[PDB]
């Protein structure tokens, strides 16, 4: 079964290797959309799926061990 | 209307303009 989580303002990355001062820059690129539904997998019994890609992947994780 | 062309309405209707004109007439007379 699936389990979703609202990602509020996540996955905003630096688009290019250019320094910019106090400037509002309007870019157009592959971004994860704001206030979206990311999928909250567990894979723990052991079941990790083979997911598509389709245009990039934002991948967050919260693990104090090394798994 | 046409291929991306549009006409916007005026802010003041022509009734409202008539009310400005009648006020100028009533003030003056």
């Amino acid at each position: 079964p699936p389990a979703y989580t609202n990602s509020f303002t996540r996955g905003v990355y630096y688009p290019d290797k250019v320094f910019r001062s106090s400037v509002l820059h309007s870019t157009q690129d592959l971004f994860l959309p704001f206030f979206s539904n990311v999928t909250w997998f567990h894979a723990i019994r052991f079941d990790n799926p083979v997911l598509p890609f389709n245009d990039g992947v934002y991948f967050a994780s919260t693990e104090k061990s090394n798994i | 209307k046409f291929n991306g062309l549009t006409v916007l309405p005026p802010l003041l209707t022509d009734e409202m303009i008539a009310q400005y004109t009648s006020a100028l007439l009533a003030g003056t007379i």
Binding site: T5, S7, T9, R10, G11, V12, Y14, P15, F19, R20, S21, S22, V23, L24, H25, S26, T27, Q28, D29, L30, F31, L32, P33, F34, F35, S36, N37, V38, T39, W40, F41, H42, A43, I44, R45, F46, L51, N54, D55, G56, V57, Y58, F59, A60, S61, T62, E63, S65, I67 | -
Partner: protein
């Protein structure tokens, strides 16, 4: 065999327009997604973070083609292309063979099943998009 407790969050990227705000030190502190609701779209249209009062002719709109019909020809025979592509003898180039093609349904599947095709050059059209146009003569 035995593990702990994993959990990972997967989301997918989409082509979007953002408005990023770089502060003095070159770091990003805030961003506005120009397709969310309406005030962030207005802030990305103005290229500002303060919007004073008034109507701001932001984007635009236009309903979308729901479904899709395709009323085409009636049917007819097939116009045999193998008359011109499989004749026993071709005329020489000084008196070249000419043929007008009458109305039919023109399957170009055939005409592809012939040869390794040393030259296949369309000019006003493209061969990948040949099965949708409908020429008169």
């Amino acid at each position: 065999w035995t593990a702990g407790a994993a959990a990972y969050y997967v989301g997918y990227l989409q082509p979007r327009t953002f408005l990023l705000k770089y502060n003095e030190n070159g770091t990003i502190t805030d961003a506005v997604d120009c397709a969310l609701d309406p005030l962030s779209e207005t802030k990305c249209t103005l290229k500002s973070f303060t919007v004073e009062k008034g109507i701001y002719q932001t984007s635009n709109f236009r309903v979308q083609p729901t479904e899709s019909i395709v009323r085409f020809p009636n049917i007819t025979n097939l116009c045999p292309f193998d008359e011109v592509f499989n004749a026993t003898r071709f005329a020489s180039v000084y008196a070249w063979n000419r043929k007008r093609i009458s109305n039919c349904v023109a399957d170009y599947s055939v005409l592809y099943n012939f040869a390794p095709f040393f030259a296949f050059k369309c000019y006003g059209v493209s061969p990948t998009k040949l099965n949708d146009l409908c020429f008169t003569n």
